[PDB]
Amino acid sequence: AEEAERLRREAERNREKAEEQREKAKKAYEKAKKGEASEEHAAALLAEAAVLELKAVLLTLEARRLYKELGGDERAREALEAAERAREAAREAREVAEKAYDAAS
Amino acid sequence: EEAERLRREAERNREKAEEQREKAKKAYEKAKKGEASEEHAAALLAEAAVLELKAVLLTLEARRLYKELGGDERAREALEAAERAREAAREAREVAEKAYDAAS
Amino acid sequence: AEEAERLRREAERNREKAEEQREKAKKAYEKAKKGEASEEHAAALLAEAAVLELKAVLLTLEARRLYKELGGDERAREALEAAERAREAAREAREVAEKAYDAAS
C-alpha cells in the first residue's frame, strides 16, 4: 500500500537522476574536448549511468514482488511502471555516456 | 471500439505528459541559473495538472468499460494504458512543481 | 523481440542526434543576431533536422507494427516510447533550425 507508493517515488527519483546523467553525457559529447581529463570525465558518466541502471533493475525486481503480493493493485502496477521507466532512462543515459567516452578517446 | 478509442486517448495523454516533463525539467535546470520565469513555470504546472486529471478520468472511464465488457482483453488494455498515462502525468506534475518552487 | 531492442536503440540514437542538432541550431540562431550566421549552414541544419524527423516517423510506424505483433510486450512498448521521444526531439530540432534559417536570411 504505502510501500508501493514509496517504491514509486524512489523509482521516479532514480529516473530524474538518469535524465540528469544523460544531459551531462550529451554536453560532454558536444564539447569534444579530447585528452585524459575529458576521457576520465566521460568514464565517470559511464560509471554513474551503469550504477543507475542496476539500481533501477533492483527496484523493478522489488516492484514485481510487490505486484504479485498485492495481486495487481494499481498502486503496485504504477510502481512497477515507474521502475521500468527509470531503467529505460538510465540505460539511455549509459548509451549516451558510451558515445561521449568513445568520442573522447 | 470505445475500448480502442480509450486506449488511443490514453496513449496521447501519456505522450503529452512525456513532453511536459521535459519542458518542466528544462525549466527546473534553468531555475538553478537564476533566470527562470515563475509565470512560465506556473503554466507548465497548470498543464501538467490538467493532464493528470484527464488521465484519472480516463482511468475511471476505462474501469467502467472493463466491468461492462466482463474483462475483455481490449478493455483490460485500455485500462492499463490509462494507468500508465496517469503515472506519466503525475511524474510530469512533480517535475513542474519543482520547477515552479525553484523559480520562486 | 530482438527487433524491438534494435528499434529502441535506433530511436535512442535518433533522439540523441536530434538534441545535438538542436544545440547546433540554437548557436546558429544566436549567431544570426550578431549577423555572423551563414545562410548555407542554417539551411544545412534544417535539412539534417528534417531527415531526423523523417527517420522518426519511420521508427514510430515500425514500432507500431511491432507493438501489434508482439501484443504489448514491454520491449515493444519501450521501442514505441523511444520512437515517440525521437519524434519530438527531431521536431524541436527542426523548429529551431527554421528560426535560425529565417533569421540568417
Author numbering:
A (entry chain A), C (entry chain C): 0 to 104
B (entry chain B): 1 to 104
The publication says:
To explore whether peptide-responsive hinges could be turned into protein-responsive hinges, we used inpainting with RoseTTAFold to add two additional helices to a validated effector peptide, resulting in fully structured 3-helix bundles (3hb). For nine of our validated hinges we designed and experimentally characterized these effector proteins using SEC. Hinge-3hb binding was tested qualitatively by SEC and, for hinges which had a corresponding FRET construct, quantitatively with the FRET-labeled variant, and DEER was used in addition to FRET to confirm that 3hb binding caused the same conformational change as effector peptide binding. For two designs, 3hb05 and 3hb12, we obtained crystal structures that agreed well with the design models, indicating that the three-helix bundles are fully structured in isolation. The affinity of 3hb05 to cs074F was similar to the affinity observed for the original peptide cs074B, whereas 3hb21 bound its target hinge cs221F significantly tighter than the original peptide cs221B. The 3hb approach was able to rescue designs for which the peptide alone or the hinge-peptide complex had shown the tendency to form higher-order oligomers.
We set out to design proteins that can switch between two well-defined and fully structured conformations. We reasoned that these goals could be collectively achieved with a “hinge”-like design in which two rigid domains move relative to each other while remaining individually folded. The hinge amplifies small local structural and chemical changes to achieve large global changes while the chemical environment for most residues remains similar throughout the conformational change, avoiding the need for global unfolding. Designing one of the resulting conformations to bind to a target effector couples the conformational equilibrium with target binding.
